[PDB]
Symmetry: D2
Subunit: 217 residues, 4 copies
Amino acid sequence: SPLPATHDLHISGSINGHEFDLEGSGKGNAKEGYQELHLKSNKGDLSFSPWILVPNIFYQYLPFPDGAMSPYQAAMHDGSGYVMHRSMQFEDGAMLHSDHRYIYKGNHIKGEFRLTGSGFPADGPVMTNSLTAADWCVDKLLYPNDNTIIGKFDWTYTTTSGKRYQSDVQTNVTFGKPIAADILKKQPMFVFRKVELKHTKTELNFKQWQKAFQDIA
Amino acid sequence: SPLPATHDLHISGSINGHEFDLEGSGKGNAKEGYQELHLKSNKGDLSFSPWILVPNIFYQYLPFPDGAMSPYQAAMHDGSGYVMHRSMQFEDGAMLHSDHRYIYKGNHIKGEFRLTGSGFPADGPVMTNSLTAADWCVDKLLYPNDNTIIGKFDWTYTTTSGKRYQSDVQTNVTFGKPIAADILKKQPMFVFRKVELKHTKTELNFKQWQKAFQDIA
Amino acid sequence: SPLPATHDLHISGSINGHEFDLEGSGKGNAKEGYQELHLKSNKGDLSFSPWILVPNIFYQYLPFPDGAMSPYQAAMHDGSGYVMHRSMQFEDGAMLHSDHRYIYKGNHIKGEFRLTGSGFPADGPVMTNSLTAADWCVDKLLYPNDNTIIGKFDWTYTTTSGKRYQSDVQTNVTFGKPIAADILKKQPMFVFRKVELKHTKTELNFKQWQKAFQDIA
Amino acid sequence: SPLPATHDLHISGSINGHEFDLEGSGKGNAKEGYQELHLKSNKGDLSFSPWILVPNIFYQYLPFPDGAMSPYQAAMHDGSGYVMHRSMQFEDGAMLHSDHRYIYKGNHIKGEFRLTGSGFPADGPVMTNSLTAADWCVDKLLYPNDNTIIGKFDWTYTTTSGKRYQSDVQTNVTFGKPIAADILKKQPMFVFRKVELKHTKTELNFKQWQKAFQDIA
């Protein structure tokens, strides 16, 4: 494959025991690190805040510095691929995990993601649709061996009450073939990201900007 | 349904990106809190320690004190049911999550569990088959609302090197109908458990003893 | 050197930047694991709930099963002693850590404990004095080497709003001489404890029951 | 009151039960965020890696973007000041917490820091003096109220074995007077830092570069 230009997602699972299922498609610019995505519900109104689906709703769009391939782009490029496993542990006892898989067809990505979240209090901000935005975020990446990335960040939403809603997030990424040795020797790597989300109870329109860096200006 | 006497399990998922699939059946005594289970692999040799599948491999077998129904037994009994979501966060960066579902037919339980684990180091004890036993364990249960249990324990295996292998475990359990009010008012509830496991690379024979308590002798 | 019968405590430090200092004395029965303590403020009214000082306000009072000395007792008996280091991570972002040391004079203990707590929200239960009790509690102990105990528990208070207030607690105990070999081979050890506190803005009256167990029944 | 030019530090406490005490002085440039420090032992050879004292061994040296004073600087400028409380939770079970306070005399700072670390395994890198460097680091800052900063980062050293040594770090900073409203509305704030340490068993020579950023580029 070449770098991606378009993508689809089917995302499904359960929040607090209630099933959900969404699909749609979007596109992005792999040299800039931008992507956008539209999603629509196949099982009626979401009963939880759609913001809880971020960051879950495609690092193939992420270049590394000076136009290098990120390990994600390189795994798409030679077709050997990767999967992701993410965990989000919320300050109020809720947890959400996801599993991520992809199929490539030329410059188009197809994502199949599965999520389980539970323990969201009925009066907390996820179940009351009170999340208003996600903070700008720096992700820290380490490669503990030649085919694995362990990434971590502190994830916070703003909410209608003025209190932030916080979680610890860890993303383990497992590659089909080893990561090139010139990528392995630049650790740690950071990525700055921004997101936007518009939503109804049945539809999401998401956008993301990402930029990798080892050092700041 | 009455209290359970027999059960089946189909458990599947992936460890470090490698898929696995096991099935088999067992039985237990719901007044005593004991169960046993046999499992066999449908996809060849396991490439990871089978001990990592404990505690994942049926609280319907657990009575509450003085022969009362645990909330699990009560949900089986009226057929309204529950699901479980567990998270295990290992000291060496590995994570494993599971989702648990059941179907009842009279006094027989059918379990369908899905797991994802990743980030297990190639020389750590899970990937080198070096786990030797799980420690006796006290689980602490709270009910933050009328249809949810949040349980927690510190989980440790002994290993061939003599060092323990540790993880934090949280289990969120979500019920179809509310939990009876006489159970909700006894918090917290503790459960003492012991397990045994014999295994090969393709087969497991597991046993478990459990006992609920609010206080000790 | 005999088992403890009486004890004094001077405990000081700060909570959210405000200093506090209390002193008093108590007694207990080292055969039964009971102790009680009275404390009085040296710096005016406490500006935080005095419950946040439990569990910090003497395991020399704790026997092991069948009349055996606990490791804490044996270190007092031979004079070699120990220090403790405790950490409390609250669900709302606050933290509290303490440092415990002791001087023995015959069957009397003197404690000097130092504490720093911070990040307690102004409308949370510690700062509005809304904690009403501490839940009964099971401590899990391990000995990763011959002179160290690592213990853990999930600590929850009830509050006036009905919502529990949770923290993760880890206690690291370091001994001046090795623990006896027969204590070391019995792992994990659990300890069941209950406490009571009555308080004013300047005074505390504290009671505690503790009992070690390896198994139940 | 001017921005800092020089500083002294007396830092003491214990690691695994062994006491240590160091003092020395340094300087830096409060316009650029650079500082350096020399420390010498008052109690013989350190029995642990001196790297475990970073990051604990002065944010008064940190400016905010465009020549703005950081909150740390403004609290020194008006004399109202702040304290810090830091916690380090290591992947192998050790913990280290510290308490920081300051006295200002013109453009000179005096620090008195107190630390307790424990539970470092005898064959781990802190006790065998195998830490070789600290990874470059991004600190995320939030202000949950007008006089408190909660900061977080994942802290990793490299070691002689090639395996990284990780910890979760949280720093809570409490101010004597409210932070300015224009600092408060810019959240999250990130800080990029690099450090160097050369050491012997009795002496440390430490350098640090820091730079605040809200976004990159």
